[PDB]
Design a protein around this nucleic acid. Structure first.
Ligand SMILES: [Mg+2]
Ligand SMILES: [Zn+2]
Ligand SMILES: [Zn+2]
Ligand SMILES: [Zn+2]
Lengths: 48, 432, 29, 48, 78, 115, 59, 66, 258, 59, 466, 44, 181
RNA sequence: GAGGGAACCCACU
């Protein structure tokens, strides 16, 4: 994120722990939601 | 003694469970809340639990030896809790995926695909027999879609009588062309593949899993959202009874003649397999003479594997496309696939054209010997037959190496089921 | 003389029948 | 021991409090019936 | 002063119907006119439809307070 | 264990009525005939014979459950005609049909046996 | 029952199609299931993962 | 074990045909010709005799308790 | 009165089968006649077995089931025989049942074939069909094995048990050239012609008849031996007529009761 | 602390079950193991071990 | 060598002579990794590019890679492999004649089919499994059709008229063992016919069916609450108490055999075999040889089943939807080959890797016998007599009656025995136990919100206490 | 009562507490007689 | 509302999950009240404006009149009110849906009843419902891991994931050509 | 009008 010409907004990890330690608890909440949604909707499955 | 047979007000009589009793009905594993639903008891003269077919989907049940449990509520409070909370019509639509859990399954589904086609015409006696099994029928025989030369009703008229209330729903059949909606015949479908139900009348379209199944926006979903649980329960029952009694006239089978393709189709499949094997040999020669350029992010062996798998997947896809293109409208594999009842186009492809590549742990068949998959091959054989590409169909029969590699492939699925059950159950327990 | 391909199926099931006439099925136990 | 009595899925808590054998329960093989409504189960006369 | 929903929940409907059915089965006076039916559940549901069930639902707030709603005060929407 | 006796498909027990007639209140001049301990045989012939009567507006039968032995025949007629009368006339026509078929079968057997 | 013809086995109330291969322990027929094991006296070199050893030979 | 009295599908008598069928097979008939000589036209009756395993003969090789 | 006027054309009459054609009737009438052929023609079959001795390799229910499946001659005697449910006797009498006895002991080194010839009836009008072809093998005995039993045969029809089904095969056909399109062939040229087909070899299927209905029906009623096949057809017509007459009586009583 | 199930009661429900139980091999790897490699159908099982006959479930 | 082996019992030429001739040799897995196998001798007699010119060995037959249970599958190379695995599982559960001397043996569980048939469609490997001599199953006229909806989701419709004629009828044999034991000088269990005013703690049952030796006699009908062995143990006016052996509940039957002998340590030892006839029922499990398991959903009589123009009704109707996702095409080919086999009067060959047998050849052979070449027939509705619009695939297929009857599984409990420690209901139908309302059921009823039903199940239908 | 010897096919009278041995051939496995009670089978 | 939507949904995915199916109920009103779409309508546009205003007033998720309650109520029904004003636009209701006055009044009543039927009931054990709703599809489940092992790596907060990874996005011209990437 | 537990194995969905 600190590197030059790297987007400091959209750049993200799939590691939950480092997202928590770098960006905080609401960001790791959103990252957890995104990764769970990816796992669920890989198959085309939908959960509310 | 009769002195002990006297009943006073305030006594309790532990009477036998009778017709109309409310029970909880359950199948292990109880994964979501619709694996335990409330049912009304009907006594039937054999030793099994008789179950409605649409109900088999929320239980994940079939009748290949499944045993299910039945709990009788003992008080009026628990009976009313089950009646007002856990009955099957109240469990039609789940909060998990805001869509129905139970839909029309397999014979009702196959014959509602066959029943709502445009060229289905029922005589007066057939219509009266079908209306005998419509429990929500108002007693008025509708005016037939054809009055002369002979009075004939269509299947869409009878299903319009089945459809409750004034449901308005637009769906598409599974064989709906992609360019039809942009063409001049959007609202007059040449293939009857746009389902329109208006004022509870099936105006047009062939019904299938996309209309009567467990998907969001489907006809049973709109029936639940507009008419409630009881009318939708009657809808499910009426679809099943009327369609299952029309299927006595129509009939549905599967035979060995549904696995046969044309001779021209067999020639096309053999030509595609020969060309793809030649392409794999050419890629092998390019890799062997060090003329194969690695792609970014991958090593030479994995680029070779990607190229070979691309060629063989193109082979399997083209042979399968020829297999479905050979199929007539009378083909029963095609009937069960386009109804959404059972099977897929991959199953038709494997039965008719090519079983395909066998994979273990996501790669081709490994060199379990010294650089050989089997001792019937030469060492360092990276061709399709050696590494598990089955060029035969299930109709043609497998070669012994193909049989063994297919067994290696299917053992992977059996292992995956057996070892995934425990970790999934532990995940469910921890989540709960 | 060599076994012709039209006689091969009958010949191979003859030798398999000979194997199971001698050894049987529980010979290892 | 008492710890082995209390622990595990067969222990006291998980095997006798979170879940337990019940009266007024029946179990048998299921067979289809297209003539029953979706809220209706066919029951043998012996179980009833 | 009552902040909870004016609609009777599905759990409230289930428990009020079961409790009223048990009371009718223990020979409570029937609050409606019954047209010769025996089952206490049916009498309880036609009492609920007539909104004549003599039961008060006490809904507990997480702060420890409560609101008392008559069955005739709630909306039976389901 | 739960096997019913095999005579229960065709034997009425004590107090079991053979045929019961109920007026169908949905439409005028319609009746439901519940015939006990019968099957698709009589239901099919009676339904098809009622379909031949031009004063019958609806004729159908159903077995509500194949594990039970019960026929429901719904008959709707014209207002100047009765569903009971239609059902009786259908049975009378079927009886005359079978009497004629019986005597013609006897005549044909005699002719085939004499040569 | 060794060396007996099928007629002698039938006279002893034994089935001649019965394969043998089992024991009778307290009247119960017991079969010994064959047990797989690693072969003895052979050097096998593996790569232990997530350990202090890069490779290991075992005999 | 013993030949069924009836064909399972249709109920034609096949219980009086097993010894006649064995005698026809001993008389160098083919199985199809032996089935055709016995009047078994439907293949449901032909699977009765074609697929029969007469285990009662081997059961009769044991000395009876009674 | 909208009754049909059906006609009969017998095309074959052997001791085993009758082939005939019914014209000018409805499909439901024809199918119900076939269903009464299979299910509701009463014959006499063994229904009560008391085994006194059974040293055979076959157990007692096995022997009883095989005895029940043996056909017994029922011509002209099943009409005058009463159902045991309708009879005034306590357990059994000659007015509702026929007594059979079997007493076979094997004392020889040859295997004794206990057949239906060893079933000795107390009524000469009700005998095993093969005792008027070989005899139906009941059991095989070795030396020292014995079989004594007493049976009772009673009236019944195939709706109760298939041992009372008098027909072997009721071949039923209509519209052999498929003029009505009641079946739809994906490839009509792949289908063999019927025995009753009236088509040339170049043609595979009749032209469609939109005004047609099933009007001509072909039967091959094969008898198992209990009745003559013509007796099966006549008894089926009589039984269907009696069912309709009893239903009419109950219907008239129900109409007068309301 | 000893291996169990080496000796089993011989299956006598069918002759095929008797033959299959008399020709039965067992990997003494615990069925609670969730690794797939001992359960996989190896290439070297050709002609030695039946590729179809395996139990369903934990074994 | 082949000519010498054709007269094995004349020349005394055997397999061991073939090994000694240097013709065959045993290769293990380590040596097989260095050999070069020809799959067939057609790999040897090959032209300029044989893909290998250094073959060292040849397979005797490739279908010998299967085991005992996989060798009864007809056309196993036309099936999906998990279905071959499922048939290899279920061929051990199929009831036939398990052994010839079953009348001598008193096994605890025994199962004997009335009329086991050899398959019309066999494999050659089945000639050495003795499946022709001890078969497990019946060739059944199977129509693959959707009829009345009662065969859906892996179910079958059976012909009730066929079942009445002995189709798949079986016998269940159960043996009960008991012995007098001298567990101490004063304690003396004895086989006696007990007397009500003398024995302590009877189970309120009848004892008249016992003979005066304390043992029931063969040929006597018994029910679930009946005494078959009367054993009394001396109590150190009730000098002895009742420890009689009872019949297992709801298992009605007839005492087939009673055997009295001495055990190892010289006490009286009785074994009683009780016989019960199992007629096929709704809920009984049936399987073809291709993984097509399924319970009987309904039984129709012959006049209700659909029929061909020859009057043939199917013995079993299976759903078409059992086929497509499974791709058990070997089931269809076995049905077609069985139609050909039953018409021709021969036993069809379904060895896996056989080029002499092809679907086109079987189709032409079937068309030579007056049937449609793909096995379809015009079926007529049993109820109405009208032709079914579709043409139904129908023909002989080998089916197996599996051990899993519904009467061995049906179980209900209202109230009854409870455990000593936790005072909850017992285990299993054999002990009149209750069903487990487990943790997952508790979670489901939490999600339902039914708290009073949760309290009923987990408190006052299991173990109330104050 | 009367027990058939398993080997020698002969009937033998055995009282209670008498060891089960055939007086002819000394065989220890013996079988009860078929009952004299009257058992009815439906022929179904 | 459009600007708020494009802030909320920056990918332009218009498929949302909302309580009341407005298009289907407009079609229901058209079928019930026999709306002729080729005739002029008797529905005033100001009736549409004011009816949607009062309807949005009476669709309450958060009770109360304090500014915190009003902000929470506005937030909880923001998407549904945006979709309601988008669907029951006076322009769309006049030239596209062509509803009458009585059809519009029935539409408002139906929207209110369907929204009040959609509110979560107190007593809903939504945690058990969520745990069963994320475990039931688990029964049916770059080398990035997915499926059950990734679900295990998620719900167990693993300090050692199997395939840890970033998705690095580039700014400006660095994202447009491959050489500076 | 109802007196063992434990261990192991096989099997079923
Ligand atoms: Mg299942
Ligand atoms: Zn037959
Ligand atoms: Zn009498
Ligand atoms: Zn002796």
């Amino acid at each position: 994120l600190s590197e030059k010409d790297v987007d400091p907004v959209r750049t993200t990890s799939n590691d939950i722990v480092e997202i928590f330690t770098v960006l905080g608890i609401e960001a790791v909440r959103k990252a957890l939601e995104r990764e769970l949604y990816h796992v669920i909707s890989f198959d085309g499955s939908y959960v509310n | 003694k009769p002195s002990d047979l006297h009943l006073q007000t305030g006594y309790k009589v532990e009477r036998h469970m009778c017709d109309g009793d409310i029970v909880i009905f359950n199948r292990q594993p109880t994964l979501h809340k619709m694996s335990m639903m409330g049912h009304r008891v009907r006594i039937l003269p054999w030793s099994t639990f008789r179950l409605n077919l649409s109900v088999t989907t929320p239980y994940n049940a079939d009748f290949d030896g499944d045993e299910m449990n039945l709990h009788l509520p003992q008080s009026l409070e628990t009976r009313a809790e089950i009646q007002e909370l856990a009955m099957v019509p109240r469990m039609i639509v789940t909060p998990q995926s805001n869509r129905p859990v139970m839909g029309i399954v397999q014979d009702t589904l196959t014959a509602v695909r066959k029943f709502t086609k445009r060229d289905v015409f029922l005589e007066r006696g057939e219509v009266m027999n079908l209306l005998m099994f419509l429990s929500t029928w108002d007693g008025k025989v509708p005016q037939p879609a054809i009055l002369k030369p002979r009075p004939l009703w269509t299947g869409k008229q009878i299903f319009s009588l089945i459809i409750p209330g004034h449901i308005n729903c637009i769906r598409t059949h599974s064989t709906h062309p992609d360019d039809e909606d942009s063409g001049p015949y959007k609202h007059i479908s040449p293939g009857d593949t746009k389902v329109v139900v208006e004022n509870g009348e099936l105006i047009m379209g062939i019904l299938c899993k996309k209309s009567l199944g467990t998907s969001a926006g489907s006809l049973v979903h709109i029936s639940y959202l507009e008419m409630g649980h009881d009318i939708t329960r009657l809808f499910y029952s009426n679809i099943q009874t009327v369609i299952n009694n029309w299927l006595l006239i129509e009939g549905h089978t599967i035979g060995i003649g549904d696995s046969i393709a044309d001779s021209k189709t067999y020639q096309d499949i053999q030509n595609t397999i020969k060309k793809a094997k030649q392409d794999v040999i050419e890629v092998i020669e390019k890799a062997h003479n060090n003329e194969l350029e690695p792609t970014p992010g991958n090593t030479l062996r994995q680029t070779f594997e990607n190229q070979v798998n691309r060629i063989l997947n193109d082979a399997r896809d083209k042979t399968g496309s020829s297999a479905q293109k050979s199929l007539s409208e009378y083909n029963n594999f095609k009937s069960m696939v386009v109804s959404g009842a059972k099977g897929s186009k991959i199953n038709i492809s494997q039965v008719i054209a090519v079983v395909g590549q066998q994979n273990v742990e996501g790669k081709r068949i490994p060199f379990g010997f010294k650089h050989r998959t089997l001792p019937h091959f030469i060492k360092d054989d990276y061709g399709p037959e050696s590494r598990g590409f089955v060029e035969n169909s299930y109709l043609a029969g497998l070669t012994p190496t193909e049989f063994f590699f297919h067994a290696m492939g299917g053992r992977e699925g059996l292992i995956d089921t057996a070892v995934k059950t425990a970790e999934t159950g532990y995940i469910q327990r921890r989540l709960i | 003389d060599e076994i012709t391909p039209d006689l091969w199926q009958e010949a191979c099931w003859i030798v398999i029948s000979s194997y199971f006439d001698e050894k049987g099925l529980v010979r290892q136990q | 021991s008492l710890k082995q009595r209390l622990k595990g899925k067969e222990g006291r808590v998980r095997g006798n409090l979170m879940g337990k054998r019940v009266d007024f329960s029946a179990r048998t093989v299921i067979t289809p019936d297209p003539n029953l409504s979706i809220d209706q189960v066919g029951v043998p006369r012996s179980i009833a | 002063k009552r902040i909870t929903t004016p609609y009777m929940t599905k759990y409230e409907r289930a428990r009020v119907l079961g409790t009223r059915a048990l009371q009718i089965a223990m020979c409570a006076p029937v609050m409606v006119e019954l047209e010769g039916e025996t089952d206490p559940l049916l009498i309880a549901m036609k009492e609920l439809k007539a909104r004549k069930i003599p039961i008060i639902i006490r809904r507990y707030l997480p702060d420890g307070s409560y609101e008392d709603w008559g069955v005739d005060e709630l909306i039976i929407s389901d | 264990m739960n096997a019913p006796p095999a005579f229960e498909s065709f034997l009425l027990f004590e107090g079991e009525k053979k045929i019961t007639i109920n007026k169908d209140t949905k439409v005028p001049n319609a009746c439901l005939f519940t015939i006990n301990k019968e099957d698709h045989t009589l239901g099919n012939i009676i339904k098809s014979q009622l379909l031949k009567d031009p004063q019958v507006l609806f004729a159908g039968y159903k077995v509500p459950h194949p594990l039970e032995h019960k026929i429901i025949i719904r008959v709707q007629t014209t207002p100047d005609y009765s569903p009971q009368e239609a059902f009786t006339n259908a049975i009378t026509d079927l009886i005359s049909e079978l009497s004629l078929l019986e005597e013609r079968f006897r005549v044909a057997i005699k002719d085939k046996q004499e040569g | 029952l060794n060396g007996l013809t099928d007629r002698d086995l039938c006279e002893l109330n034994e089935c001649p199609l019965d394969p043998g291969g089992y024991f009778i322990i307290n009247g119960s027929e017991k079969v010994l299931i064959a047990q797989e094991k690693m072969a003895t006296n052979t050097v096998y070199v593996f790569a232990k993962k997530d350990s202090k050893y890069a490779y290991t030979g075992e005999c | 074990m013993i030949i069924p009295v009836r064909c399972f599908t249709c109920g034609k008598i096949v219980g009086n045909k097993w010894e006649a069928y064995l005698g026809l097979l001993q008389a160098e008939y083919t199985e199809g010709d032996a089935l055709d000589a016995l009047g078994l036209k439907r293949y449901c009756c032909r699977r009765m005799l074609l697929a029969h395993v007469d285990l009662i003969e081997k059961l009769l090789n044991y000395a009876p308790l009674e | 009165p909208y009754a049909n006027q059906p006609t009969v054309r017998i095309t074959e009459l052997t001791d085993e089968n009758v082939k005939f054609i019914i014209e000018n009737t409805d499909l439901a009438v024809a199918n119900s006649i076939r269903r009464v052929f299979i299910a509701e023609v009463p014959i006499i079959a063994i229904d009560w077995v008391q085994i006194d001795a059974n040293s055979s390799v076959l157990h007692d229910e096995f022997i009883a089931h095989r005895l029940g499946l043996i056909p017994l001659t029922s011509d002209d005697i099943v009409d005058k025989l009463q159902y045991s449910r309708d009879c005034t006797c306590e357990e059994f009498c000659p007015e509702c049942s026929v007594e059979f006895t079997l007493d076979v002991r094997c004392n020889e080194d040859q295997t004794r074939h206990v057949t239906s010839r060893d079933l000795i009836s107390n009524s000469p009008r009700v005998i095993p069909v093969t005792s008027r072809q070989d005899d139906i093998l009941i059991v095989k005995l070795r030396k020292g094995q014995e079989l004594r039993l007493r049976a009772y045969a009673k009236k019944g029809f195939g709706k109760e048990h298939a041992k009372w089904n008098p027909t072997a095969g009721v071949a039923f056909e209509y519209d052999p050239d498929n003029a009505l399109r009641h079946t739809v062939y994906p490839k009509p040229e792949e289908w063999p012609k019927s025995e009753y087909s009236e088509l040339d070899e170049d043609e595979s299927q009749a032209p469609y008849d939109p005004n047609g209905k099933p009007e001509r029906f072909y039967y091959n009623v094969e008898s198992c031996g209990s009745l003559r096949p013509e007796t099966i057809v006549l008894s089926a017509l009589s039984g269907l007529k009696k069912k309709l007459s009893d239903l009419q009586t109950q219907l008239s009583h129900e109409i007068q009761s309301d | 602390q000893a291996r169990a199930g080496v000796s089993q009661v011989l299956n006598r429900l069918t002759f095929a079950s008797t033959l299959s139980h008399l020709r039965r091999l067992n990997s003494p790897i615990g069925r609670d193991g969730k690794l797939a490699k001992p359960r996989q159908l190896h290439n070297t099982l050709w002609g030695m071990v039946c590729p179809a006959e395996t139990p369903e479930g934990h074994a | 060598h082949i000519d010498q082996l054709k007269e094995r019992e004349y020349n005394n030429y055997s397999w061991q002579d073939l090994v000694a001739s240097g013709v065959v040799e045993y290769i293990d897995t380590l040596e097989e990794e260095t050999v070069m196998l020809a799959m067939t001798p057609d790999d040897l007699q090959e032209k300029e590019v044989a893909y290998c010119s250094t073959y060292t060995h040849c397979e005797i037959h490739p279908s010998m890679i299967l085991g005992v249970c996989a060798s009864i599958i007809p056309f196993p190379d036309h099936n999906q492999s998990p279905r071959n695995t499922y048939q290899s599982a279920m061929g051990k559960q199929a009831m036939g004649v398990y052994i010839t001397n079953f009348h001598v043996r008193m096994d605890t569980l025994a199962h004997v089919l009335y009329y086991p048939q050899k398959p019309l469609v066999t494999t050659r490997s089945m000639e050495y499994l003795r499946f022709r001599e001890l078969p497990a199953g019946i060739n059944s006229i199977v129509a693959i059709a959707s009829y009345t909806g009662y065969n859906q989701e892996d179910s079958v419709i059976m012909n009730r008229s066929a079942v009445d004629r002995g189709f798949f009828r079986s016998v269940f044999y159960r043996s009960y063992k008991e012995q007098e034991s001298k567990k101490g000088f004063d304690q003396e269990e004895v086989f006696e016919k007990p007397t009500r005013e003398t024995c302590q703690g009877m189970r309120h049952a009848i004892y008249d069916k016992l003979d005066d030796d304390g043992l029931i006699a063969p040929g006597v009908r018994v029910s679930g609450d009946d005494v078959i062995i009367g054993k009394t143990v001396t109590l150190p006016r009730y000098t002895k108490r009742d420890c009689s052996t009872f019949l297992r509940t709801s298992e009605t039957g007839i005492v087939d055999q009673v055997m009295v002998t001495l055990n190892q340590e010289g006490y009286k030892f009785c074994k009683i075999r009780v016989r019960s006839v199992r007629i096929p029922q709704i809920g009984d499990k049936f399987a073809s040889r291709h993984g097509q398991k399924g319970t009987c959903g309904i039984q129709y009589r012959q006049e209700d089943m659909p029929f061909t123009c020859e009057g043939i009704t199917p013995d079993i109707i299976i759903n078409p939807h059992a086929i497509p996702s499974r791709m058990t095409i070997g089931h269809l080919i076995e049905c077609l080959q069985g139609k050909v086999s039953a018409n021709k009067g021969e036993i069809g060959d379904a060895t896996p890797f056989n080029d002499a047998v092809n679907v086109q050849k079987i189709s032409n052979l079937l068309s030579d016998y007056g049937y449609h070449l793909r096995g379809n027939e015009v079926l007529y509705n049993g109820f109405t007599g009208r032709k079914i619009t579709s043409q139904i695939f129908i023909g002989p297929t080998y089916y197996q009656r599996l051990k899993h009857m519904v009467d061995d599984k049906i179980h209900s409990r209202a109230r009854g025995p409870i455990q000593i420690l936790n005072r909850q209901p017992m285990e299993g139908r054999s002990r009149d136990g209750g069903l487990r309302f487990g943790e997952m059921e508790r979670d489901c009823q939490i999600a339902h919100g039914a708290a009073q039903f949760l309290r009923e199940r987990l408190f006052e239908a299991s173990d109330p206490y104050q | 009562m009367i027990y058939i010897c398993g080997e020698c096919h002969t009937e033998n009278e055995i009282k209670s507490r008498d060891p089960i041995r055939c007086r002819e051939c000394g065989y220890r496995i013996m079988y009860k007689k078929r009952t004299k009670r009257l058992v009815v089978f439906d022929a179904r | 509302d459009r600007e708020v939507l494009r802030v909320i949904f920056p990918t332009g995915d218009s498929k949302v999950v909302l309580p009341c199916n407005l298009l289907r109920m407009i079609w229901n009103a058209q079928k019930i009240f026999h709306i002729n779409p080729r005739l002029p309508s008797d529905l005033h546009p100001i009736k549409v404006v004011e009816g949607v205003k009062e309807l949005s007033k009476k669709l309450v998720i958060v009770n109360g009149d304090d500014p915190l309650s009003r902000q929470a109520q506005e937030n909880a029904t923001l998407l549904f009110n945006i979709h309601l004003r988008s669907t029951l636009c006076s322009r769309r209701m006049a030239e596209e849906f062509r509803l009458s006055g009585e059809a519009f009044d029935w539409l408002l009543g139906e929207i209110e009843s369907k929204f009040n039927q959609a509110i979560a009931h107190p007593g809903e054990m939504v945690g058990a419902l969520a745990a069963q709703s994320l475990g039931e599809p688990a029964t049916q489940m770059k080398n990035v891991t997915l499926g059950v092992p990734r679900l295990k790596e998620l719900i167990n907060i693993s300090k050692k994931p199997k395939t840890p990874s970033l998705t690095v996005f580039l700014l400006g011209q660095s994202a447009r050509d491959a050489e500076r990437a």
